[PDB]
Amino acid sequence: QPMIYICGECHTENEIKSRDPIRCRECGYRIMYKKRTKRLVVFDAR
Amino acid sequence: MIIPVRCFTCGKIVGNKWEAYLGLLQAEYTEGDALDALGLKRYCCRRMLLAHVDLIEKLLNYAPLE
Amino acid sequence: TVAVMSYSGYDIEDALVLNKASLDRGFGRCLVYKNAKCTLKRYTNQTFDKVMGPMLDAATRKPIWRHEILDADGICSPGEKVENKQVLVNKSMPTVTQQPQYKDVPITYKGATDSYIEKVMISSNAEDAFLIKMLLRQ
Amino acid sequence: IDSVAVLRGIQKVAMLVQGNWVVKSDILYPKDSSSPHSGVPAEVLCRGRDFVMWKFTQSRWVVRKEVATVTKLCAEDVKDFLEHMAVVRINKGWEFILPYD
Amino acid sequence: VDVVHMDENSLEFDMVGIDAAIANAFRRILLAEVPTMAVEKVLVYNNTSIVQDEILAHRLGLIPIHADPRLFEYRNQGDEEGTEIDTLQFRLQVRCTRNPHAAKDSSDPNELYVNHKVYTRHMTWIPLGNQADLFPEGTIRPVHDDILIAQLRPGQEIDLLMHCVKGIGKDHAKFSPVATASYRLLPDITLLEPVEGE
Amino acid sequence: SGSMDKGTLGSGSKNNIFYILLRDWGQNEAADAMSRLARLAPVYLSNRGFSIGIGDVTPGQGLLKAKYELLNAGYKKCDEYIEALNTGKLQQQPGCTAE
Ligand SMILES: [Zn+2]
Ligand SMILES: [Zn+2]
């Protein structure tokens, strides 16, 4: 349920639900990446 | 980025020769002996391995990991 | 593999005839990457831009079509395909010019053809501005 | 030069192998160096060099196809390290670049 | 008709007394109008590799499938699911992880990692309906067993689902069953004067 | 008689058979014949074959001997006029300086 963002430098889940300034929990890196969607996407093999 | 599965000009499956081709070049074959040993008679197949650049082996360092 | 010859008359002035089977196997296959970026700022007054969640259809328990690809944070999710007139970031801003009242200002994918989202970048500047960059693929 | 005493200096930086001098390991890489090339990174392992130059001391050359499996490290290390001292002949590894003085 | 050579995957034969206007028809049918089974739909769950999904789907299309195309019908217009009569299914699922033991030099990928290379042998056939009895085990497989598709690093994952259907090579070039099909007329080099000496 | 060149089927000038058709039989007849030529000539040429190669611009032995003679003769005639300017008489052509 809570949104999970993936740290750029160390690939660690941070769960930034609260309106805090963006910052990694384990390291000082300040860039976050969203995880891939759960829903399926269909591609034509062409 | 990564070796194409089929030769553009004729459709021979050259996409499985790549891990062999690099191996034979460790045994110090020349390029023209290595392609002949894999069965690439026509030169359109030969340029698939001869002109390839293995970019994915180097992009995967920068790529994120645990 | 070039044959230098005159074929089919569709090659009169610098035009060149390609092979269908070569194109299918991957000759000339290319990727176009485009950006989309959004900034959420904190004003001089203690008020802020915000991203609202997806607006659900009450009748069907699914988001409205214009919001179909939004994740629960109101930012589009990597992997999904965007189509024309669909929102990427559900931004709302204060019309301050007593409680806040917000006008919707969504970042929307204008483009004649469908694009896929590869990654979404979230970072913040020292002024408490939130920066979002989307990478799009065709 | 004082061309007799100075060998106690030269012994610390070069050692004679196959009629010629060869650079010692500690001059090129101390034990925290990163990979010098692109591709997959690797850690320094100086005995992974010293074993190769040891084989040149006992045998005529390094003479077999797949020494990179025995010493486990990358072919991109061994075939690059060798390339500063030798030239390739077909199948039998490398040729020592200068004659047996 | 004289068959002069034949082995696995290759054949050479002579046709005598037929004209170019009919021999070229046989060449063109083999390229474009003999049908085969090839992947058209890929349903992707959690692709986290560096290989783009549209590129991965293109690669998986070009893998030749050993299924005999005479036993399957054409899938109708629309009909996204398909059935036992007219589709096969494959499941590719690979997770890459670190090797729990490794030498201290740790230089080479083939020791550090497991499943860092995806190969077409990871494709598992998933039977629909009574197909599991009609086909003995190993008949429905990818042919080559060594084609690289992607290439991974630890933490990265590929999980997908393929739908092979029937089609001719005039539609798309992943349906053509031939490496190359061609012919040549036979030479008769003749000596007009006797050539002796050096 | 005669083959069809640019001067008879092309855009350069008159004496063009499509220009004759235009001036003698009307606009529609000229436009039809052009559409027929645009349709017919690709079907011939693509099944005749027509190609250029490095062997179409390679100088044969009959030229390489001729070219060597021309260069030696032409350079030596220039070298004599060089000598006639700096250190002698040069027949100065009317209206121009000696250089
Ligand atoms: Zn971090
Ligand atoms: Zn080929």
XYZ file of C-alpha atoms and ligand atoms in Angstrom:
650
model
C 0.000 0.000 0.000
C 2.598 2.771 0.800
C 4.509 4.032 -2.224
C 8.038 2.646 -2.483
C 10.761 4.518 -4.344
C 14.073 2.954 -5.338
C 17.312 4.786 -4.532
C 19.544 5.659 -7.462
C 22.940 4.982 -5.891
C 22.311 1.847 -3.812
C 18.985 0.312 -5.089
C 17.334 0.385 -1.629
C 13.601 0.678 -0.954
C 12.828 3.889 0.945
C 8.981 4.124 1.314
C 8.648 7.904 1.162
C 4.996 8.248 2.185
C 5.539 11.273 4.441
C 6.087 14.774 3.008
C 9.743 14.817 4.000
C 12.538 16.165 1.770
C 13.767 13.505 -0.657
C 16.729 11.652 0.877
C 17.808 8.028 0.995
C 17.292 6.202 4.269
C 20.621 4.340 4.244
C 22.891 6.719 2.266
C 23.028 10.396 1.474
C 21.799 10.081 -2.137
C 18.975 12.458 -3.054
C 17.590 10.987 -6.323
C 14.717 8.475 -6.341
C 13.303 6.233 -9.072
C 9.786 4.791 -9.272
C 9.340 1.016 -9.475
C 7.889 -0.814 -12.471
C 4.117 -1.240 -12.805
C 2.416 -4.413 -11.630
C -0.082 -4.426 -14.530
C 0.701 -6.455 -17.640
C 1.507 -4.808 -20.978
C 1.181 -6.771 -24.240
C 3.672 -6.211 -27.078
C 3.428 -7.376 -30.669
C 6.484 -9.448 -31.578
C 7.180 -7.528 -34.754
C 23.729 -3.439 -28.101
C 23.390 -7.222 -28.247
C 23.983 -9.684 -31.130
C 21.004 -9.876 -33.516
C 19.220 -13.211 -33.644
C 19.043 -13.409 -37.450
C 21.189 -12.125 -40.295
C 19.481 -9.139 -41.939
C 20.151 -10.293 -45.491
C 19.141 -13.959 -45.432
C 17.826 -14.914 -42.008
C 20.389 -17.484 -40.938
C 20.451 -17.760 -37.140
C 23.736 -16.020 -36.299
C 22.535 -15.070 -32.815
C 23.920 -18.228 -31.221
C 27.392 -18.052 -32.798
C 28.553 -15.108 -30.670
C 29.550 -16.879 -27.454
C 31.389 -19.447 -29.595
C 33.154 -16.823 -31.765
C 34.719 -15.066 -28.749
C 35.809 -18.457 -27.419
C 37.634 -19.474 -30.608
C 39.446 -16.112 -30.628
C 40.909 -17.060 -27.243
C 42.382 -20.148 -28.936
C 44.087 -17.665 -31.350
C 42.219 -18.469 -34.505
C 42.124 -15.668 -37.003
C 38.755 -14.069 -37.709
C 38.588 -15.669 -41.143
C 39.275 -19.110 -39.706
C 36.813 -18.623 -36.844
C 33.872 -17.710 -39.087
C 34.642 -20.629 -41.423
C 34.538 -23.006 -38.444
C 31.052 -21.807 -37.469
C 29.557 -22.282 -40.941
C 29.212 -18.686 -42.149
C 29.819 -19.236 -45.864
C 28.113 -16.112 -47.219
C 29.635 -12.757 -46.369
C 26.319 -11.245 -45.264
C 26.379 -13.596 -42.258
C 30.106 -13.033 -41.695
C 29.678 -9.289 -41.123
C 27.184 -9.938 -38.302
C 29.943 -11.257 -36.074
C 32.820 -9.347 -37.665
C 31.271 -5.874 -37.331
C 29.365 -6.363 -34.045
C 30.141 -4.265 -30.975
C 29.267 -5.870 -27.632
C 27.796 -2.770 -26.009
C 25.581 -4.587 -23.487
C 28.687 -6.059 -21.789
C 29.656 -2.427 -21.003
C 26.249 -0.778 -20.453
C 25.604 -3.418 -17.753
C 28.295 -1.960 -15.490
C 26.509 1.355 -15.136
C 23.144 -0.465 -14.827
C 21.829 -0.535 -11.239
C 22.233 -3.582 -9.036
C 21.770 -4.701 -5.419
C 24.469 -5.379 -48.746
C 24.038 -2.944 -51.642
C 23.293 -3.928 -55.220
C 23.976 -0.898 -57.424
C 21.260 -1.264 -60.065
C 18.104 0.357 -61.442
C 15.083 -1.329 -59.908
C 11.329 -0.604 -60.079
C 11.534 3.055 -61.100
C 10.804 4.230 -57.531
C 14.467 5.262 -57.209
C 14.785 8.006 -59.828
C 16.210 10.882 -57.769
C 18.303 9.680 -54.781
C 15.456 7.435 -53.548
C 16.578 3.990 -52.440
C 14.662 0.708 -52.404
C 14.841 -1.272 -49.158
C 14.120 -4.937 -48.451
C 11.090 -5.838 -46.328
C 12.713 -8.925 -44.830
C 15.791 -6.964 -43.736
C 13.643 -4.369 -41.966
C 11.698 -7.112 -40.190
C 14.920 -8.690 -38.941
C 16.115 -5.379 -37.505
C 17.910 -3.292 -40.127
C 17.430 0.367 -39.273
C 15.508 -0.324 -36.068
C 15.804 2.733 -33.850
C 14.615 4.138 -30.544
C 13.450 7.699 -29.880
C 13.665 8.927 -26.292
C 11.832 12.070 -25.208
C 11.616 13.958 -21.932
C 8.797 15.275 -19.821
C 9.488 17.243 -16.662
C 7.395 18.881 -13.958
C 8.334 21.164 -11.067
C 6.336 21.485 -7.837
C 7.292 24.637 -5.962
C 6.804 26.080 -2.482
C 5.669 29.687 -2.693
C 6.437 32.740 -0.559
C 3.120 32.244 1.173
C 3.132 28.882 2.976
C 1.341 27.033 0.182
C 2.493 24.411 -2.272
C 1.754 22.633 -5.511
C 0.460 19.119 -5.010
C -0.212 15.922 -6.927
C -3.668 14.488 -6.385
C -4.277 10.781 -6.793
C -6.171 9.289 -9.728
C -9.798 10.334 -10.021
C -11.765 7.097 -9.840
C -15.010 6.404 -11.620
C -17.451 5.821 -8.747
C -19.597 3.558 -10.942
C -16.872 1.079 -11.984
C -14.026 1.224 -9.358
C -11.462 2.031 -12.065
C -9.751 5.324 -12.945
C -11.157 7.474 -15.720
C -9.515 6.883 -19.110
C -7.599 10.176 -19.063
C -6.039 8.972 -15.758
C -5.661 5.269 -16.709
C -1.873 5.029 -16.271
C -1.525 7.021 -13.048
C -0.106 5.255 -10.010
C -1.463 6.027 -6.520
C 0.914 8.988 -6.121
C -0.533 10.702 -9.195
C 2.652 10.175 -11.212
C 2.684 7.800 -14.188
C 4.254 4.390 -13.669
C 7.161 2.840 -15.617
C 6.276 0.210 -18.189
C 2.810 1.448 -19.129
C 1.949 2.933 -22.510
C 0.753 6.495 -22.757
C -1.691 7.601 -25.450
C -2.706 11.065 -26.641
C -4.502 13.387 -24.174
C -3.543 11.277 -21.134
C -2.066 12.786 -17.991
C 1.410 11.967 -16.729
C 1.458 14.107 -13.551
C -1.822 15.111 -11.863
C -0.490 18.516 -10.756
C -2.735 21.077 -9.020
C -1.693 24.609 -8.127
C -3.054 27.323 -5.796
C -4.952 30.190 -7.425
C -3.842 32.620 -4.698
C -3.051 35.278 -7.394
C -9.429 31.470 3.514
C -8.515 27.814 3.005
C -6.700 26.881 -0.253
C -8.628 26.341 -3.484
C -6.836 24.528 -6.289
C -6.989 24.614 -10.078
C -5.887 21.531 -11.990
C -2.816 21.946 -14.217
C -2.039 18.406 -15.470
C 1.029 17.553 -17.515
C -0.414 15.707 -20.505
C 1.107 13.631 -23.303
C 0.526 15.452 -26.551
C 1.873 13.338 -29.391
C 0.360 11.638 -32.442
C 1.694 8.187 -31.484
C 1.932 6.039 -28.374
C 4.946 6.184 -26.066
C 6.151 3.915 -23.266
C 7.498 5.105 -19.911
C 10.946 3.766 -19.077
C 11.726 5.545 -15.790
C 10.470 8.292 -13.486
C 13.038 10.394 -11.622
C 12.143 12.147 -8.362
C 14.546 14.619 -6.773
C 14.383 17.809 -4.738
C 16.249 21.103 -4.707
C 17.291 23.044 -1.598
C 14.332 25.459 -1.952
C 11.933 22.493 -1.204
C 10.976 22.381 -4.890
C 10.211 18.844 -6.042
C 11.515 17.898 -9.479
C 10.035 15.055 -11.542
C 11.482 13.864 -14.862
C 9.879 11.208 -17.081
C 11.794 9.308 -19.761
C 9.572 8.225 -22.666
C 10.329 5.612 -25.335
C 9.200 4.980 -28.925
C 77.573 5.501 -12.559
C 78.503 3.271 -9.598
C 77.728 0.257 -11.791
C 78.316 -2.491 -9.185
C 76.655 -1.408 -5.911
C 73.459 -0.160 -7.623
C 72.118 -3.715 -8.174
C 70.845 -3.718 -4.580
C 68.629 -0.862 -5.771
C 67.654 -2.491 -9.068
C 66.780 -5.823 -7.358
C 63.950 -3.992 -5.555
C 62.388 -2.727 -8.809
C 63.287 -5.227 -11.570
C 64.308 -8.876 -11.773
C 65.955 -10.659 -14.699
C 63.733 -13.168 -16.554
C 64.567 -14.923 -19.875
C 67.779 -12.977 -20.445
C 66.081 -9.596 -19.933
C 64.682 -7.349 -17.226
C 60.997 -7.545 -16.248
C 59.157 -4.927 -14.166
C 58.187 -5.978 -10.641
C 54.536 -6.147 -9.579
C 54.543 -3.419 -6.886
C 55.525 -0.714 -9.411
C 52.333 -1.111 -11.439
C 49.552 -1.764 -8.913
C 49.286 -1.529 -5.127
C 46.572 -3.715 -3.593
C 43.572 -1.249 -3.799
C 43.693 -0.340 -7.522
C 40.499 -0.402 -9.575
C 40.128 -1.997 -13.005
C 42.162 -0.214 -15.691
C 39.775 -1.202 -18.508
C 36.131 -1.139 -19.563
C 33.870 -4.124 -19.518
C 33.296 -5.946 -16.230
C 35.335 -4.445 -13.346
C 37.892 -6.628 -11.592
C 39.990 -6.343 -8.460
C 43.779 -6.292 -8.421
C 45.500 -9.613 -7.692
C 49.260 -9.281 -8.169
C 49.968 -13.015 -7.852
C 47.616 -13.396 -10.826
C 50.353 -11.512 -12.683
C 53.344 -13.007 -10.833
C 52.241 -16.579 -11.619
C 52.250 -15.682 -15.333
C 55.802 -14.292 -15.217
C 56.799 -17.293 -13.068
C 55.593 -19.611 -15.857
C 57.853 -17.702 -18.268
C 60.751 -18.458 -15.880
C 60.296 -22.248 -15.852
C 58.821 -23.073 -19.262
C 59.890 -21.716 -22.633
C 56.596 -19.725 -22.703
C 52.981 -19.823 -21.616
C 51.939 -22.439 -24.114
C 48.307 -23.463 -23.601
C 44.891 -22.269 -24.611
C 42.852 -21.702 -21.465
C 45.141 -20.523 -18.648
C 42.349 -17.996 -17.865
C 40.248 -20.863 -16.460
C 43.085 -22.145 -14.235
C 43.751 -18.664 -12.813
C 39.957 -17.881 -12.896
C 40.261 -14.196 -13.872
C 39.065 -12.500 -17.075
C 40.599 -13.164 -20.471
C 40.356 -9.358 -20.865
C 42.950 -9.098 -18.069
C 45.436 -11.773 -19.213
C 45.398 -10.896 -22.928
C 45.828 -7.191 -22.056
C 48.630 -7.692 -19.502
C 50.525 -9.959 -21.943
C 50.129 -7.371 -24.748
C 52.703 -5.028 -23.150
C 55.500 -7.634 -23.293
C 54.819 -9.891 -26.287
C 53.343 -10.447 -29.766
C 50.942 -13.249 -30.760
C 51.704 -16.257 -32.936
C 48.914 -18.610 -34.020
C 47.599 -20.893 -31.196
C 50.862 -20.982 -29.184
C 50.129 -17.878 -27.101
C 52.629 -15.067 -27.428
C 56.186 -14.497 -28.682
C 58.847 -12.930 -26.455
C 59.629 -9.663 -28.212
C 63.433 -9.528 -27.899
C 66.256 -12.074 -28.291
C 67.950 -14.173 -25.600
C 70.924 -12.013 -24.622
C 14.933 -34.927 -60.271
C 18.352 -35.845 -58.858
C 19.012 -35.336 -55.147
C 22.765 -34.776 -54.930
C 23.174 -33.888 -51.230
C 20.993 -33.957 -48.120
C 21.610 -33.831 -44.367
C 20.137 -32.063 -41.351
C 18.796 -28.625 -42.329
C 20.263 -28.672 -45.861
C 19.325 -30.079 -49.257
C 20.656 -29.725 -52.794
C 18.821 -31.206 -55.767
C 18.637 -30.855 -59.543
C 15.482 -30.217 -61.569
C 15.879 -30.870 -65.301
C 13.365 -29.901 -67.973
C 11.350 -27.365 -65.971
C 11.283 -23.688 -66.981
C 12.381 -20.590 -65.027
C 8.778 -19.375 -64.750
C 7.947 -22.432 -62.587
C 11.241 -22.964 -60.738
C 11.049 -19.336 -59.624
C 7.545 -20.027 -58.321
C 8.936 -22.765 -56.057
C 11.654 -20.359 -54.852
C 9.049 -17.699 -54.028
C 6.648 -20.053 -52.194
C 9.434 -21.317 -49.905
C 10.387 -17.749 -49.011
C 6.947 -16.221 -48.586
C 4.019 -18.656 -48.654
C 4.954 -21.791 -46.670
C 3.637 -21.209 -43.112
C 5.388 -21.707 -39.760
C 4.753 -21.069 -36.061
C 6.257 -17.909 -34.561
C 5.664 -15.654 -31.546
C 3.310 -12.726 -32.096
C 2.249 -11.672 -28.597
C 4.391 -11.195 -25.509
C 2.704 -10.523 -22.162
C 5.318 -8.961 -19.913
C 5.295 -9.144 -16.115
C 8.144 -7.278 -14.317
C 10.790 -6.824 -17.012
C 13.673 -5.118 -15.196
C 16.505 -5.850 -17.643
C 18.381 -3.231 -19.650
C 16.909 -4.708 -22.854
C 13.893 -2.631 -23.903
C 10.564 -4.459 -23.975
C 9.933 -3.635 -27.641
C 13.412 -4.932 -28.496
C 12.958 -8.074 -26.379
C 9.620 -8.801 -28.057
C 11.228 -8.387 -31.490
C 14.005 -10.840 -30.579
C 11.609 -13.465 -29.208
C 9.632 -13.241 -32.449
C 12.589 -14.337 -34.547
C 13.302 -17.546 -32.573
C 12.154 -20.506 -34.714
C 9.715 -22.890 -32.988
C 9.887 -26.640 -33.728
C 6.060 -26.988 -33.886
C 4.803 -28.694 -37.032
C 2.564 -26.033 -38.642
C 0.235 -28.497 -40.382
C -1.398 -29.468 -37.072
C -2.559 -25.899 -36.280
C -5.125 -23.611 -37.865
C -4.929 -19.895 -38.541
C -6.147 -17.774 -35.667
C -9.201 -15.770 -36.719
C -9.421 -11.987 -36.947
C -9.544 -10.513 -33.473
C -9.536 -13.436 -30.993
C -6.825 -12.262 -28.613
C -6.946 -15.394 -26.442
C -6.903 -18.247 -28.955
C -7.270 -21.927 -28.163
C -5.753 -25.425 -28.376
C -6.431 -25.562 -32.121
C -4.430 -22.505 -33.130
C -1.896 -21.322 -30.535
C 1.033 -22.512 -28.497
C 2.319 -20.856 -25.361
C 5.788 -20.451 -23.837
C 6.840 -19.024 -20.462
C 10.216 -17.327 -19.982
C 11.103 -16.597 -16.351
C 14.664 -15.819 -15.202
C 15.915 -14.200 -11.984
C 19.586 -13.256 -11.717
C 21.382 -13.597 -8.376
C 24.902 -13.552 -6.981
C 26.838 -16.771 -6.539
C 27.123 -17.474 -2.766
C 30.756 -18.593 -3.203
C 33.424 -16.990 -5.383
C 37.192 -16.652 -5.489
C 38.744 -13.478 -4.086
C 39.885 -12.223 -7.513
C 36.162 -12.292 -8.540
C 37.001 -11.057 -12.035
C 34.756 -12.973 -14.433
C 30.943 -12.956 -14.728
C 30.595 -16.741 -15.185
C 31.810 -17.234 -11.586
C 30.292 -14.169 -9.880
C 26.744 -14.598 -11.133
C 24.178 -17.243 -11.981
C 21.576 -16.766 -14.754
C 23.446 -13.671 -15.952
C 22.831 -14.903 -19.512
C 19.345 -15.696 -20.725
C 19.264 -18.460 -23.320
C 16.350 -19.828 -25.306
C 16.501 -23.067 -23.238
C 14.792 -21.140 -20.425
C 11.593 -21.153 -22.541
C 9.175 -23.673 -20.992
C 6.227 -24.895 -23.056
C 2.849 -24.410 -21.352
C 0.236 -26.819 -22.791
C -3.275 -25.601 -23.573
C -6.045 -28.209 -23.498
C -5.249 -31.740 -24.668
C -1.951 -30.644 -26.335
C 0.032 -32.411 -23.583
C -1.147 -35.804 -24.904
C -0.988 -35.058 -28.644
C 2.680 -33.999 -28.425
C 5.311 -36.141 -26.671
C 7.668 -34.264 -24.349
C 10.367 -32.312 -26.149
C 8.544 -31.983 -29.478
C 7.394 -28.415 -28.743
C 10.688 -26.637 -28.098
C 12.799 -23.860 -29.545
C 15.088 -25.374 -32.161
C 18.558 -24.017 -31.439
C 18.894 -24.308 -27.597
C 21.652 -21.645 -27.539
C 20.225 -18.283 -28.722
C 21.040 -15.392 -26.414
C 18.040 -13.157 -25.801
C 18.960 -10.841 -22.945
C 21.881 -10.560 -20.546
C 21.466 -9.834 -16.860
C 23.053 -8.605 -13.629
C 21.918 -9.494 -10.093
C 18.587 -8.171 -8.936
C 17.254 -8.004 -12.499
C 14.355 -10.158 -13.614
C 12.472 -11.209 -16.746
C 9.048 -12.875 -16.667
C 6.869 -13.102 -19.744
C 4.456 -15.224 -21.733
C 4.558 -15.870 -25.474
C 1.790 -16.824 -27.918
C 2.962 -18.642 -31.047
C 0.519 -18.626 -33.962
C 0.597 -19.629 -37.627
C 1.482 -17.271 -40.453
C 3.087 -17.087 -43.857
C 6.303 -15.280 -44.747
C 4.640 -12.715 -47.001
C 3.202 -11.202 -43.815
C 6.373 -10.998 -41.723
C 9.855 -12.372 -42.253
C 9.953 -14.333 -38.973
C 7.605 -16.861 -40.549
C 9.873 -17.921 -43.398
C 11.158 -21.493 -42.958
C 14.294 -21.205 -45.127
C 17.783 -19.914 -44.369
C 18.046 -19.218 -48.024
C 16.323 -20.867 -50.954
C 17.803 -20.262 -54.379
C 18.851 -21.931 -57.589
C 21.437 -21.643 -60.274
C 21.556 -22.910 -63.815
C 24.197 -25.495 -64.453
C 27.478 -24.498 -66.108
C 28.863 -26.213 -69.178
C 32.281 -24.687 -69.792
C 33.537 -26.038 -73.109
C 36.994 -25.895 -74.682
C 36.904 -24.760 -78.302
C 40.566 -25.584 -79.004
C 42.795 -28.082 -77.164
C 44.785 -26.305 -74.460
C 48.125 -28.043 -73.896
C 51.512 -27.117 -72.503
C 51.902 -24.618 -69.685
C 15.077 5.076 -87.131
C 17.122 6.566 -84.333
C 17.379 6.042 -80.603
C 15.557 8.291 -78.139
C 17.850 10.698 -76.313
C 17.342 13.597 -73.921
C 16.892 15.819 -76.974
C 13.854 13.798 -78.073
C 12.206 12.574 -74.849
C 13.546 15.046 -72.265
C 12.865 18.508 -70.885
C 15.741 20.392 -72.517
C 14.208 21.818 -75.663
C 11.784 21.337 -78.541
C 11.903 18.514 -81.144
C 10.419 16.489 -78.284
C 7.820 13.909 -79.299
C 5.660 14.854 -76.302
C 5.853 18.467 -77.461
C 4.749 17.332 -80.937
C 1.785 15.459 -79.412
C 0.883 18.527 -77.337
C 0.947 20.906 -80.302
C -0.679 18.571 -82.841
C -3.073 16.272 -80.951
C -3.857 17.943 -77.621
C -2.964 17.993 -73.954
C -4.504 14.644 -73.010
C -2.461 12.702 -75.573
C 0.830 14.112 -74.258
C -0.100 13.277 -70.652
C -1.094 9.704 -71.551
C 2.156 8.955 -73.409
C 4.211 10.252 -70.465
C 2.319 7.952 -68.093
C 2.932 5.028 -70.465
C 6.671 5.784 -70.655
C 6.848 6.083 -66.852
C 5.215 2.643 -66.636
C 6.996 0.826 -69.491
C 10.672 1.825 -69.132
C 11.079 0.593 -65.492
C 9.743 -2.809 -66.571
C 12.401 -3.091 -69.275
C 15.331 -1.608 -67.344
C 14.798 -3.533 -64.104
C 14.815 -6.825 -66.031
C 17.693 -5.886 -68.315
C 19.978 -4.883 -65.477
C 21.983 -1.677 -65.467
C 24.922 -1.139 -63.163
C 28.060 0.913 -62.605
C 31.225 -0.488 -61.051
C 34.873 0.324 -60.395
C 35.650 -1.406 -63.700
C 33.645 1.245 -65.513
C 36.085 4.011 -64.519
C 39.335 2.068 -64.565
C 41.925 3.381 -67.049
C 43.067 0.838 -69.587
C 46.654 0.472 -70.770
C 45.921 2.434 -73.950
C 45.311 5.544 -71.836
C 48.129 5.188 -69.274
C 50.735 5.290 -72.042
C 49.011 8.251 -73.732
C 48.656 10.209 -70.472
C 52.359 9.847 -69.625
C 53.370 11.254 -73.032
C 50.987 14.217 -72.694
C 52.220 15.188 -69.215
C 55.904 15.067 -70.220
C 55.289 17.027 -73.436
C 53.043 19.612 -71.784
C 55.267 20.193 -68.746
C 58.396 20.604 -70.893
C 56.677 23.209 -73.077
C 55.712 25.121 -69.918
C 59.280 24.895 -68.541
C 60.642 26.531 -71.699
C 58.315 29.530 -71.381
C 59.380 29.775 -67.719
C 62.973 30.115 -68.951
C 61.929 32.564 -71.683
C 60.317 34.851 -69.095
C 62.953 34.938 -66.355
C 66.086 34.775 -68.533
C 65.340 35.726 -72.122
C 62.783 36.815 -74.686
C 59.107 35.910 -74.412
C 56.842 36.890 -77.306
C 54.615 39.267 -75.359
C 51.049 38.908 -76.620
C 49.228 42.156 -77.511
C 47.414 43.992 -74.725
C 48.939 42.095 -71.788
C 52.097 42.252 -69.702
C 54.750 39.533 -70.005
C 53.626 37.775 -66.801
Zn 20.969 5.584 -1.139
Zn 23.289 -13.900 -44.224
